Design a protein around this ligand. Structure first.
Ligand SMILES: Nc1ncnc2c1ncn2[C@@H]1O[C@H](COP(=O)(O)OP(=O)(O)O)[C@@H](O)[C@H]1O
Length: 520
């Protein structure tokens, strides 16, 4: 029946995506962000999810971070209610609050109720870990139609199921909390995780902490051993400044960590304005980064292949935007360029969304092709399809030819557009019709009407009929196609090729084409 949304339920951030008109689309939360902190907080008997919970993660003791780590387990998390009593919550319930939130704002964006989803998980996850994830989904009112692996999701986003050949794919996932490297074998639509290895206590958070150590060391140096470890408001601000600094060093060779009024001492207010170079940040985080090297070789050997045999490498996780990470990965797979062309923090959700569409039935797969798959033609005298843009021409393009009138004293012309490789326009699929009058009584062949088929680089078509004498010009704009639908029309022409050529004997396109008027 209804839409099946794609959810990446991540350790540190979550992302939600859905198929819209044959494309995956990432949905943005109410704060306009395409990803959402996997963080829940409790205050005044009100549940807070995402950015607002992250903004009080150190200050509010109730905040629950990295709940995903306790999934599958029987552990509990205790939080204070308003009255001082203690409520106890399972990892299924906390995750269900995050999923409810994602589900909520998606309904508001889509404007429909949503009750089905694909949820992704780490490849290593066992059945309890997956049943807790599935139970989270049920508590949130979502029929979980399938649970898929994060790196399998990544491969669907990159259309690797469409390769029509065996593919060895290395997926390097460095998130905020977790690192995973997986080796996939993808053959005839079956996804097999040959091998997985990594560290679920290693991620971009650990990179930030080295910046917190840096800022701390600097403060102690500058202010006679000033230590703010036990100050919650201070530590909240450092954690945030650390992550801002880190992110800026993925596009800058340095940055300024700026923390005015960090605290006040008997000396007055302490202001930090601290430079951190990319070189320095890389040095401080070298130990963390290098814990990702051996795992790459480990899974390569575990699946009994050379590096040579790897067909494609995908970068997943937002921490893979870091230059040092991209460089590392490249160093371990000579020849291959790691693929980062789909937002690594969105890529998994996108894959789930694709899987969702495929499970539904509405797999109206649009294709952003740079070349025209079929001939585009105007109907001339006798129902003949005179081509203007030939099959396999590269967009953008605008071809033009002058036509005339089929009958003497003809007041107007019908501009009937059609797509396909067949000699009669009735055989081809029509894309539109429109009229153009203003035409003065004359012999057939006298009026000179410049027709212009025009395609933008995004694909869509505009056909511009112009009477050159009277300047009168009507024009229509056109919608796109499926792969099966393309192939049906190619097949149809292939199937009637003998019939069509005998029709073509009588057709002569080298003379000026003629457009007629049949009454609407
Ligand atoms: N431009 C960037 N440079 C460095 N790190 C980044 C950048 N953008 C996002 N990150 C980091 O990505 C990490 C995790 O992102 P994400 O993939 O959403 O995590 P997860 O999949 O674990 O939920 C965060 O620690 C964040 O600091």
């Amino acid at each position: 029946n209804g839409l099946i949304i794609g959810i990446d339920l991540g350790t540190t951030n979550s992302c939600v995506s859905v198929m819209e008109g044959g494309r995956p689309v990432v949905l943005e939360n109410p704060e306009g962000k395409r990803t959402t902190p996997s963080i829940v907080s409790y205050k005044n008997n009100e549940i807070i999810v995402g950015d607002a919970a992250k903004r009080q993660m150190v200050t509010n003791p109730n905040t629950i971070v990295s709940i995903k780590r306790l999934m599958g387990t029987s552990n509990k998390v205790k939080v204070q209610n308003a009255d001082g009593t203690t409520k106890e919550l399972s990892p299924e319930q906390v995750s269900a609050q995050i999923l409810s939130y994602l589900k909520d704002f998606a309904e508001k964006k889509i404007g429909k109720k949503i009750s089905r989803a694909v949820i992704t998980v780490p490849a290593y996850f066992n059945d309890a870990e997956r049943n807790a994830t599935k139970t989270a989904g049920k508590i949130a009112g979502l029929n979980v139609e399938r649970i898929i692996n994060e790196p399998t999701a990544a491969a669907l986003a990159y259309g690797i199921d469409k390769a029509s050949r065996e593919m060895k794919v290395l997926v390097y996932d460095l998130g905020g909390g977790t690192f995973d490297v997986s080796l996939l074998d993808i053959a005839e639509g079956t996804f097999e995780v040959l091998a997985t290895a990594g560290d679920n206590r290693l991620g971009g958070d650990d990179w930030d902490n080295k910046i917190i150590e840096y800022i701390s060391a600097y403060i102690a140096k500058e202010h006679q051993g000033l230590n703010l470890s036990k100050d919650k408001m201070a530590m909240q601000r450092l954690k945030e400044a650390a992550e801002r600094a880190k992110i800026e060093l993925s596009a800058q060779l340095e940055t300024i960590i700026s923390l005015p009024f960090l605290t006040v001492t008997q000396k007055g207010p302490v202001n930090v304005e601290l430079k951190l170079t990319r070189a320095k940040f890389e040095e401080l985080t070298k130990p963390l980064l290098e814990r990702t090297r051996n795992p790459i070789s480990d899974v390569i050997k575990e699946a009994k292949i050379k590096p040579e045999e790897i067909n494609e490498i995908l970068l997943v996780g937002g921490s893979t935007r870091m230059p040092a990470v991209q460089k590392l990965v490249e160093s371990m797979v000579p020849g291959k360029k790691p693929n980062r062309s789909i937002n690594p923090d969105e890529v998994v959700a996108i894959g789930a969304a694709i899987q969702g569409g495929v499970l539904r039935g509405d797999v109206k797969d649009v294709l952003l092709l740079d070349v025209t798959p079929l001939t585009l033609s105007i109907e001339t005298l006798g129902g003949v399809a005179t081509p203007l843009i030939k099959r396999n021409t590269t967009i953008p393009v605008s071809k033009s030819q002058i036509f005339s009138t089929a009958q003497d004293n003809q007041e107007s012309v019908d501009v009937v557009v059609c797509q396909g490789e067949r000699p009669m326009s009735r055989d081809n699929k029509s894309l539109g019709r429109f009229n153009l009058g203003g035409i003065q009584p004359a012999p057939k062949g006298k009026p000179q009407i410049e027709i212009t088929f025009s395609l933008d680089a995004n694909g869509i078509l505009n056909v511009k009929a112009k009477d050159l004498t009277t300047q009168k010009e009507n024009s229509i704009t056109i919608s796109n196609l499926s792969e099966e639908e393309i192939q049906k029309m190619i097949r149809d022409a292939e199937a009637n090729k003998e019939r069509d050529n005998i029709i073509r004997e009588r057709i002569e396109l080298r003379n000026e084409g003629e457009l007629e008027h049949h009454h609407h």
